[PDB]
């Protein structure tokens, strides 16, 4: 499922992400453009053996368990398979654990392509 931009913004507002830990809603939406290109099914194998999964590319070394990862700490008590749903709740709840740990610097696409920029642009035009 490829979310639309306002669609995703609005699924995010309904799940409590707006200004969560101070990060305005544009940050979360921008994070998903660059991590997953809005794709709930996105999976990338990483250079360290881990894999990221879903809309907010949640990492299988630290946060989700996938069975094939070295140093798996599974600090969201969740299978990576559960984060690949349309219906973004699983991914949002783990995103709240992560952001509460380094802030959104956990998301490399956010650090590199969203942080310090006009992030609300990503929700500008949505109701």
């Amino acid at each position, epitope marked *: 499922k490829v979310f639309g931009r306002c669609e995703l913004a609005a699924a995010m507002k309904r799940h409590g992400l707006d200004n969560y830990r101070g990060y305005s809603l544009g940050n979360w939406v921008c994070a998903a453009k660059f*991590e997953s290109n809005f794709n709930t099914q996105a999976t990338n194998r*990483n250079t360290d053996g881990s894999t990221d999964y879903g809309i907010l590319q949640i*990492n299988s070394r630290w946060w989700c368990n996938d069975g094939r990862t070295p140093g798996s700490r599974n600090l969201c008590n969740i299978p990576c398979s559960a984060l690949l749903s349309s219906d973004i709740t699983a991914s949002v709840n783990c995103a709240k654990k992560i952001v509460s740990d380094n802030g959104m*610097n956990a998301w*490399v696409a956010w*650090r590199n392509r969203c942080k310090g920029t006009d992030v609300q642009a990503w929700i500008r035009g949505c109701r």
Partner: nanobody
Framework: VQLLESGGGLVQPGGSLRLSCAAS????????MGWVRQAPGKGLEWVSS????????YYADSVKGRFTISRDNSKNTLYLQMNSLRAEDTAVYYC??????????????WGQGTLVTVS
């Protein structure tokens, strides 16, 4: 922060090579690091990781038992001992680490890579 790979070159099938990575600008003794490789024209594959003060090592299923990863913490150098090199191992091999764990994307910082050709 510098990661300078060395010791890649031509080797015949069945042979061996040891890759070295000179690390500076950070506390080597502890940092998680690893080797990643890019074959032509595949994506970037993980090869091996060594984590923490523990030194707990790990390896891809394509290289278990053949390659050995090691820190020489007296010269702040990371070693990959490659044995029984086989055509499919031709790649650029890079030394990688994380810029700010815990993070996604795996290793986001890497050296220049050294070329290994098994023919």
């Amino acid at each position: 922060v510098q990661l300078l790979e060395s010791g890649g070159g031509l080797v015949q099938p069945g042979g061996s090579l040891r890759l070295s990575c000179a690390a500076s600008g950070f506390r080597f003794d502890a940092e998680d690091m690893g080797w990643v490789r890019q074959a032509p024209g595949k994506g970037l594959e993980w090869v091996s990781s060594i984590y923490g003060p523990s030194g707990s090592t790990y390896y891809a299923d394509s290289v278990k038992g053949r390659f050995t990863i090691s820190r020489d913490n007296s010269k702040n150098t990371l070693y990959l001992q490659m044995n029984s090199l086989r055509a499919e191992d031709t790649a650029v091999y890079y030394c990688a680490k994380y810029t700010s764990p815990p993070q996604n994307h795996g290793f986001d910082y890497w050296g220049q890579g050294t070329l290994v050709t098994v023919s």
